[PDB]
Design a protein around this ligand. Sequence first.
Ligand SMILES: [Cl-]
Lengths: 129, 112
Amino acid sequence: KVFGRCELAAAMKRHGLDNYRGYSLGNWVCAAKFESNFNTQATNRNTDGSTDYGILQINSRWWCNDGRTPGSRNLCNIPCSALLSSDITASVNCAKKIVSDGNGMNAWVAWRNRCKGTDVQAWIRGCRL
Amino acid sequence: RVDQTPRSVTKETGESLTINCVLRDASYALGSTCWYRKKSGEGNEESISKGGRYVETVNSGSKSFSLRINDLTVEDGGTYRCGLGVAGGYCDYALCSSRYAECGDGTAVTVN
Ligand SMILES: [Cl-]
């Protein structure tokens, strides 16, 4: 599914991401824009031979099992296929686990590059939420 | 960024070493912490189990984490690195090259 921006903001809000670990909802929508361009099926190989899956481009070396990544740790305890659903639940719950330790939303490099230090409220403006 | 000091150090057998790490330029709270050692002449990096001779000090306000190593011998020569853990305390040296954690630049230890 390729989500619309406000459609995704709504889905993220119902899934409890607004102000999760102190990160306002706009952060999350902006992250998805620059990570997956709002495409739940985005699947991007890395040069270490891992893959990034889904709307938030979660990496198979650490977080999910795709069966093809040596050194794989499956820290979200899910198959990588769950991260490619039109239902964002598995992605959200994994991202909530990610963000609650380590480097926060710096776990999403596109968030660092395009979202951190901007008016992230732009990403939820114009939306009926 | 995680600032690790000292970068290099020489100690006598029987001394202790304390390495200090501070997480800077971050707007998030300090999470779980990890320590790694690669023994001289060994090539495998390994996690350090905290406790006993290895004493960690964490200060949440200053986002500082330090490790004391007691009772050094030549067997302790090598390189040491601190870093951020993930997923509620999971540590792995490969995190240091990942987008999910930061690590200090290392401490090269020589023990006389
Ligand atoms: Cl010292």
